Amino acid sequence: RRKKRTSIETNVRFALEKSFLANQKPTSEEILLIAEQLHMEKEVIRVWFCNRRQKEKRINPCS
């Protein structure tokens, strides 16, 4: 549940961090490109960015 996974993990996010903001619209190529770097694949990529930005919103309260 946890999930949680966490998960998230890693290393990636770290890199995604800076990257996220920069652009937040990763293209197809952009990802694959970054994937080549190491260890990151389209998968977690999107999953990341996606969920990553979700945290942004928010507002949320927004809640």
Resolved by:
NMR
Q: Give Cα separations from 28 to 31, 54, 61 (angstroms).
A: 6, 20, 31
Is the separation of the CB atoms in 48 and 12 below 8 Å?
A: yes
For residue 46 the two structure tokens come to: 């999107």
Helical spans, DSSP H, in the chain: 11-22, 28-35, 42-54
CATH number of 1-63: 1.10.10.60
Angle, vertex CA 21, rays to CA 20 and CA 26, nearest 5: 50
Is the separation of the CB atoms in 6 and 16 below 8 Å?
A: no
Query: Residue holding tokens 């309260």?
Result: 61
CA atoms within 13 A on the CB side of 36: 5
> Which positions ≥6 away from 42 have C-beta within 8 Å?
31, 32, 35
